[PDB]
Design a protein around this ligand. Structure first.
Ligand SMILES: COc1ccc(Cl)cc1S(=O)(=O)Nc1cccn2ncnc12
Length: 298
């Protein structure tokens, strides 16, 4: 196996993994690896109609998300189908470390599809999980693992008022641009768009985005994609919620400005709970240092 290194970008539906390199010249390059010998539940999706989570789809996602997001991994490409790639991923710098599929199957969160030392480990992992009755081998149908996914809040005003600007636990599921996200609100499972109050990063269009838009996307995306966070629901604008993300490592709204990836905006600065004085001040910090969006050649 031609072994390769990477960083976990995200865990997808069916526990396919997105792995990215270090950025050199532009946005980092990404690889979608599907875990080779194993089957996991497909998450909730929608198109002609809403289809719900399969049983054990979401608990599997969470398991690997909580273990992997932003770890350095290594991976092999067991095959390439006619442009999907199949392979193994190991937590750590070398290939004798934790095989993630083995960890998956061991919790009862995945099973093998319809031999060798690798597939012997997985049968062992499957039989340990089937004997201990973990995950989908547990005595049940699994219905309690399926989320009541709501893709629209019925009345945003009431819903924003209901929480009284008290931080709602949340997972960030997608970053459209540097200052708007898709976030999964817990414990209800409302999947909603959240814009950061008081800022606007540059945006994407057509075949050509504004300057630093991919930069700001990457910035917010590398720090927050598939992380547990808390979000202060501060107001709404149509189906979009205005709000502010809390994470231990800092305030993303506050950083984006201080690193010259965003500009203050007047309409939405009033609802910023954490203090409109401080956003105005961090804009000035990046301005005075002539940083990025504030360069003389831009
Ligand atoms: C998990 O990571 C994060 C999640 C959310 C936020 Cl708001 C920040 C981070 S961070 O720690 O990775 N980066 C930085 C923190 C502090 C100062 N700076 N300056 C430039 N970068 C940072």
């Amino acid at each position: 196996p031609t072994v390769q290194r990477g960083i976990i970008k995200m865990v997808l539906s069916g526990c396919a993994i997105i792995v990215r390199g270090q950025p050199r010249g532009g946005p980092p390059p990404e690889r979608q690896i599907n875990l080779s010998n194993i089957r996991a539940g497909n998450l909730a999706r929608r198109a002609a109609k809403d289809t719900p989570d399969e049983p054990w789809a979401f608990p599997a996602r969470e398991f690997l998300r909580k273990k992997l997001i932003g770890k350095e991994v290594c991976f092999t490409i067991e095959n390439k189908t006619p442009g999907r790639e199949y392979g193994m991923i190991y937590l750590g710098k070398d290939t004798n470390g934790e095989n993630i599929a083995e960890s998956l199957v061991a919790e009862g969160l995945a099973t093998r599809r319809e031999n060798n030392p690798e597939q012997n480990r997985l049968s062992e992992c499957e039989e340990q999980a089937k004997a201990a009755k973990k995950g989908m081998w547990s005595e049940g149908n699994g219905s309690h693992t399926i989320r009541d996914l709501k893709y629209t809040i019925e009345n945003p005003r009431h819903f924003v008022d209901s929480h009284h600007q008290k931080p709602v636990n949340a997972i960030i599921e997608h970053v459209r641009d540097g200052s708007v996200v898709r976030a999964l609100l817990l414990p209800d499972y409302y999947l909603v768009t959240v814009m950061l109050s008081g800022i606007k990063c540059p945006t994407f269009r057509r075949e050509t985005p504004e300057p630093f838009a991919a930069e700001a996307k990457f910035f917010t995306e590398s720090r927050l994609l598939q992380r547990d966070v808390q979000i202060i629901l501060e107001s709404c604008h149509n189906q979009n919620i205005l709000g502010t993300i809390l994470h231990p490592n800092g305030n993303i709204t506050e950083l984006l400005l201080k690193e010259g990836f965003a500009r203050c905006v007047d309409w939405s600065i009033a609802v910023y709970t954490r203090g409109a004085e401080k956003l105005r001040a961090a804009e000035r910090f990046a301005k005075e240092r002539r940083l990025r969006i504030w360069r003389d050649y831009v």
